[PDB]
Amino acid sequence: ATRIAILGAGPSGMAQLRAFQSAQEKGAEIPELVCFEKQADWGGQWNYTWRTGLDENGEPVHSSMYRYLWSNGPKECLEFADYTFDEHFGKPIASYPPREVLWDYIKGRVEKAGVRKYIRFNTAVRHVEFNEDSQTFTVTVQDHTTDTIYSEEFDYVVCCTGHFSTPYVPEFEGFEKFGGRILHAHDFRDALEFKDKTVLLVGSSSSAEDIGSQCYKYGAKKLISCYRTAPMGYKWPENWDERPNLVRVDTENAYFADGSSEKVDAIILCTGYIHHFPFLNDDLRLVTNNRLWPLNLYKGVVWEDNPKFFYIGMQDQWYSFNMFDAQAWYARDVIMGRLPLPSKEEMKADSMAWREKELTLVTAEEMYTYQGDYIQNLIDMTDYPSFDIPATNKTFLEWKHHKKENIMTFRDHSYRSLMTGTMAPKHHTPWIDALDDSLEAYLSDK
Amino acid sequence: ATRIAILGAGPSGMAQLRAFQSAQEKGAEIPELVCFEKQADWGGQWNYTWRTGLDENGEPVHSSMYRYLWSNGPKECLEFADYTFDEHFGKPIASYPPREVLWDYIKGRVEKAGVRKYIRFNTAVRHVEFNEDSQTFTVTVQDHTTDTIYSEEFDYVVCCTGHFSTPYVPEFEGFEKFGGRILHAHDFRDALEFKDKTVLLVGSSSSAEDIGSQCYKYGAKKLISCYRTAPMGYKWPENWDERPNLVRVDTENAYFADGSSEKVDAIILCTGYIHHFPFLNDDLRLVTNNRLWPLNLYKGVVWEDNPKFFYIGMQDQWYSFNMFDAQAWYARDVIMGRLPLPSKEEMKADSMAWREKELTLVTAEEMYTYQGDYIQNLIDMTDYPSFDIPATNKTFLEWKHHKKENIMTFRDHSYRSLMTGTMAPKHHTPWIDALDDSLEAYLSD
Ligand SMILES: Cc1cc2nc3c(=O)[nH]c(=O)nc-3n(C[C@H](O)[C@H](O)[C@H](O)COP(=O)(O)OP(=O)(O)OC[C@H]3O[C@@H](n4cnc5c(N)ncnc54)[C@H](O)[C@@H]3O)c2cc1C
Ligand SMILES: Cc1cc2nc3c(=O)[nH]c(=O)nc-3n(C[C@H](O)[C@H](O)[C@H](O)COP(=O)(O)OP(=O)(O)OC[C@H]3O[C@@H](n4cnc5c(N)ncnc54)[C@H](O)[C@@H]3O)c2cc1C
Ligand SMILES: c1ccc2[nH]ccc2c1
Ligand SMILES: c1ccc2[nH]ccc2c1
């Protein structure tokens, strides 16, 4: 024999391969593995590129990640269950490591497992089609090294292409006339471009705060945040304004709902992403807004309309890397026959339950607990090692309390590994002054 | 019973529709037409949007066009033989009109034609595939208005998706560490953004020349061109430099081959585009660098491996809009069976002859005169109205002399139309001071 196509080699696609290898390393017969990645290296979001818009082959630039990015939450909340920070580094480090430091930690585990062989890099997925007679999928790809398009036959397909890469970009009145830059969070790369400039941040996602925060750090003159969705109510610095939603812009001025206006040099639209799958027709294609429980996914992973097709990591992400492992392990066992699937209507009833519960959620605390609960459910069914989920939630809660205390100093705080119990030290340099992005400057004493 | 798929509603797609409508107006029965267009409106490149990268539906932003873009060549060189400037504006207008004015003009023709009803907008072509058993093409699209993906069958397909939209974006050493803006020409929109800024223009194409001019016109402090090809031999302003090829950048500075160094605010890569067709497999896919004569295109339009698949406007462009018409009218008459196709073996040899001629071309005048000759060959076969192609060539030569004279005032020149003989009036404002982009400003006094 059986062949499995794996779509993308970010954390999810890496988790999937790692799952099969781990089973194989325990003495199990695994199917043939082929993983298509469109970039030249693995990492998905984590593989930083200066590029924006379209890449060197004309494929949409995937990564939304920017210079000076640090761990969004505590590292202790993403720590792998089968690979620790103590293992990888040998020395206890601070709670929010920068992009390069985390990437290296993600690379350590995946290189150790030796799954790089299975990946065909620089190869973009064009189309995935199911053949009712064959009961197998056809996968058409464009290899950019030889500039040829070829297709192979597989028994199962696992889609790990993400859903934070194809921006939702709304239009406001008069954008046509605006004299400054307009970009989505997805295009944002470098805070230095906005040095001594006034930036308007539109929308209220997690990135809105952090992109805004990076701009403040690197010498922005003014930041203005506006959104219609419920105000977050933080402790913003002296030069950071919070306004009601945007109605209009003109050549150099932004207009808001209260009737007020201001001069702005650049507009950043932190307005989210869409679930986009150009390689799939409607029979296989997941359509959903970003949320904790999308429909048509049995156990959050199995495409109900075709059980031999799988999605990894398509849920909104409070948890990340631990969720993808739990999912990949489950999917793995489903492919292998270790876990039988229920009837279609039974899968749907199960899904309906998960949704009915998702609709009840109001607080931040209910939401991670719910995702915690989901991951727990997946882990109970496989040989994947369990981990302290309630304590991981508690750490999440503590991190959200620090954000509300002070939005500029939350990255200086420290947390305890739930893998080892070792308390992370305080970093040598406070966040606001730690201008050097690098791993080398992170792993040392200056 | 015969059904045609037209991919794209830029000038080419507009031309293709118009060519069929023109046959119908004459009395002929025409096949069923369906046009797919991923944008919300027609005009292709000429449809301006503030957006860059990906569009509202997450499709790649197609238009490479920027604010304050005016016609690159004489409008007389791009006039429709069947729909003149005199007929559309009802009056004489200058020779180098702003994008909006030209866009209003190309929409004019198709509005009059009434061909809008064949187009399905906000629809992106996903895949085109030919069926051996059926001898038909299966065309799969994504309708972004309905969020549905569907397919329909067509007997012929005409690809008009363009080839100046998917960027060739080379990387340079230090790009990852450079503290300023790096964009491709494809993303350039507003030259005001670069006011009082030092801008590096990398590469040598026709937009390099213009993009730099817009940045100069709108108040850049300094501009640097760097390229690998032969000297352009243009007289640039005092704040405009020429350097050899870029080698590396650091955080603030750019470095060149000769050992020179310069502080730059923004790097705009005017490095070109690739023929990119994600919706086709290798059986149908056109593979080629940007040139006047690509292979596997009989009469430059008929795809030699599958004669029922056509390509419009896929050559490099000296002539533009009336070349598309000529291709479109030819491709129309082939579809309707007015023009029979020779052996696959005989098609190859005709294409290799045009190709061997292509390789002997050195001068600019040899390059457009080649293309003039190619159009002449096309229009001789169809009822597309004859027009003075040698006199068009002479207008290109004039334009070229005007560029060589002063690169910053060539747009102030005037030309006789080769359709109506109308002498284009000198514009109310010289280009360098004509800061207002709009049609309304361009048409007033
Ligand atoms: C701005 C930002 C900041 C973030 N910060 C954090 C953080 O601090 N901590 C945390 O835990 N998580 C963070 N995340 C969440 C992030 O989604 C996960 O960390 C993780 O990257 C998700 O992995 P994934 O494999 O599911 O998708 P992705 O990381 O997006 O990777 C998907 C992969 O699929 C590939 N692909 C897509 N389309 C194709 C195609 N057609 N053909 C071939 N390959 C394709 C891509 O190249 C990519 O490698 C952040 C996300 C964003 C957008
Ligand atoms: C920056 C720039 C400036 C230029 N200036 C001039 C000038 O001054 N004078 C001149 O004569 N020429 C100019 N050109 C040349 C230009 O190629 C022509 O003017 C003309 O626009 C080409 O027409 P076209 O229809 O063949 O391609 P396009 O104008 O690019 O039209 C292609 C159409 O196909 C659509 N499309 C693409 N893919 C899909 C898909 N997947 N599904 C559905 N629809 C799709 C696009 O949305 C678009 O509408 C310029 C080109 C550029 C890039
Ligand atoms: C979207 C944007 C930023 C993010 N950080 C962590 C998850 C995530 C999702
Ligand atoms: C690419 C860029 C600019 C251009 N002007 C005329 C043709 C053309 C092609």
Coordinates of N, CA and C in Angstrom, one line a residue, chain A residues 9 28 42 67 79 116 118 125 176 258 265 288 300 400 421 445:
Chain A
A9 N 5.2 19.2 4.2 CA 6.2 18.8 5.2 C 6.4 19.9 6.2
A28 N 6.9 -3.1 13.2 CA 5.7 -3.2 12.4 C 6.0 -2.9 11.0
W42 N 12.0 21.6 4.8 CA 10.8 21.3 5.6 C 10.6 22.4 6.7
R67 N 10.7 38.1 10.5 CA 11.8 38.4 11.3 C 11.4 38.7 12.8
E79 N 6.0 21.7 23.8 CA 7.0 20.7 24.0 C 6.4 19.3 23.6
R116 N 13.5 12.2 6.4 CA 13.8 13.1 5.3 C 13.9 12.3 4.0
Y118 N 11.9 10.1 2.7 CA 10.5 10.0 2.1 C 10.0 11.2 1.4
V125 N 1.9 20.1 -5.3 CA 0.7 19.3 -5.5 C -0.2 20.1 -6.4
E176 N -8.1 52.1 -2.9 CA -7.6 52.5 -4.2 C -6.7 53.7 -4.2
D258 N -16.1 56.1 15.4 CA -16.4 57.2 16.3 C -16.5 58.6 15.7
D265 N 0.8 55.7 7.6 CA 1.8 55.4 6.6 C 1.6 54.0 5.9
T288 N -14.6 25.3 5.5 CA -14.9 25.6 6.9 C -14.2 27.0 7.2
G300 N -11.7 14.5 14.0 CA -11.0 15.7 13.6 C -10.1 15.5 12.4
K400 N -2.0 33.7 29.6 CA -3.1 34.6 29.2 C -3.3 35.7 30.3
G421 N 9.4 18.8 34.5 CA 9.2 19.5 35.7 C 10.3 20.5 35.9
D445 N 25.7 33.9 26.6 CA 25.6 34.8 27.7 C 25.5 36.3 27.7

